[PDB]
Ligand binder design. Structure first.
Ligand code: NA
Length: 436
């Protein structure tokens, strides 16, 4: 037997349901219906025996439902890798069941204070421009800003690739055949678990999509791993609003009022952190038409110039650019690199108006060095090997720093600029120069 209840009012997916005074559901209990795929989840004690719930999926006044007495639990771990699941952890890729010995509740306490990693550490991506200009912290929150055509997906895929290859980590994607086949075709699919919501659904369901993704990321973290959690257009293509209307959209709660979706998401952020065991670092894709720690800004203009990845090395940002976190040398090189690029930008019209021979000795050096910097920021990607034929490169942070230091210190002033294009370490630039 399961304790039973009758629906009182439906006003959207919010479904107030009445239960015996003798047996009230607790917050987060999942209620089910004989013969329906739908699940209702308890949010609130309204009082006098009623609970407010949200319906997950697609119920008239007076219909009877059962309390399971348990929250929603989803399969976690390695059997989720390479699979596409829905918000309740059911397979939607038609590849059959997900057989795991481990399941986890989608609602979890944040880690206790003594489980938190005391100090800030970089998550090394192996991607020169990110590690130099907008370095990620383990447990940090990254924004990836870009329109279409600018490699947004390629960059996500390479990050998935590199964290698995070099650090033994995994990724989880929470979003809403296309992306899927890209990852099979680039062989990163087996390194990432996917959870999809749906277009046209209410904004509060998006919270649950993110909660399911996060709970999966947390299992991998508990295996002692560094994990990437990708969230793609999670406030977009909803029923009730736009993006910003979805954010201030209220929902039912046990907290003493109805908090915003923007407010329930902030609580989810508490679980994105670095612990003594491992870390979860989030990457939120933000769609641009022409509490973050780092912003990766993709630009059509950099891509026009033939530079991939098309990261704007002056408009991208990171709070980790701080000598106390990255050391004096890394901080200094990042800064000198940006000053040289900025100086070149400033000289752009004078080079046009009054010619390159009109520049002073020092300004000629700045231009030459800026151009070589722009080229050394380009990088062949492992996930383009399928398309292009050339091997991708993973560049350790020590080498990124050494390479760029050599350029600003003037120890590469004798190499031609073409030699710095589409290589890895600076030693590859020297080798490439010998053939040019
Ligand atoms: Na030169």
């Amino acid at each position: 037997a399961l304790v039973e209840g009758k629906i009182v009012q439906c006003i959207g997916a919010v479904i107030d349901v009445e239960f015996p005074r003798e047996s009230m559901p607790k917050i987060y209990d999942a209620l089910i219906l004989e013969g329906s795929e739908l699940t209702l989840e308890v949010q609130q004690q309204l009082g006098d025996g009623v609970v407010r719930t949200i319906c997950l999926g697609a119920l008239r006044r007076g219909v009877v439902v059962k309390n399971t007495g348990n929250p929603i639990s989803v399969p976690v771990g390695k059997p989720t890798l390479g699979r596409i699941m829905d918000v309740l952890g059911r397979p939607i890729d038609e590849a059959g069941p997900i057989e795991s010995e481990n399941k986890r509740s989608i609602h979890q306490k944040a880690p206790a204070f003594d489980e938190l990693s005391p100090s800030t550490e970089l998550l090394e991506t192996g991607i020169k421009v990110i590690d130099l200009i907008c370095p990620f912290a383990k447990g940090g929150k990254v924004g990836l800003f870009g329109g279409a055509g600018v490699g947004k997906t390629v960059n996500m895929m390479e990050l998935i690739n590199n964290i698995a290859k070099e650090h033994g980590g995994y990724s989880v994607f929470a979003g809403v055949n296309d992306f899927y086949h890209e990852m099979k075709d680039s062989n990163v699919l087996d390194k990432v678990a996917l959870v999809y919501g749906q277009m046209n659904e209410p904004p509060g369901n998006r919270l649950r999509v993110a909660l399911t993704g996060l709970t999966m990321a947390e299992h991998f973290r508990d295996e002692g791993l560094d994990v990437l959690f990708f969230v793609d257009n999670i406030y977009r293509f909803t029923l009730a609003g736009t993006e910003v209307s979805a954010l201030l959209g209220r929902m039912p709660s046990a907290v003493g009022y109805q908090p915003t979706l923007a407010e329930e998401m902030g609580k989810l952020q508490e679980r994105i952190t670095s612990t003594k065991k491992g870390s979860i670092t989030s990457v939120q894709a933000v769609y641009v038409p022409a509490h973050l720690d780092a912003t990766v800004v993709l630009s059509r203009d950099i891509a026009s110039l033939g530079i991939y990845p098309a990261v704007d090395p002056l408009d991208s940002t990171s709070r980790q650019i701080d000598p106390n976190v990255i050391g004096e040398e890394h901080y200094s090189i990042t800064r000198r690199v940006q000053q040289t690029l900025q100086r070149y930008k400033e000289l752009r019209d004078i080079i046009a108006i009054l010619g390159m021979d009109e520049l002073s000795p020092e300004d000629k050096l700045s231009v030459a060095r800026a151009r070589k910097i722009q080229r050394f920021l380009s990088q062949p990607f492992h996930v383009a090997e399928v398309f292009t034929g050339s091997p991708g490169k993973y560049v350790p942070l020590k080498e990124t720093i050494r390479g760029f230091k050599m350029i600003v210190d003037g120890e590469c002033d004798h190499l031609p600029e073409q030699a710095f294009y589409m290589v890895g370490t600076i030693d590859e630039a020297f080798e490439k120069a010998k053939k040019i």
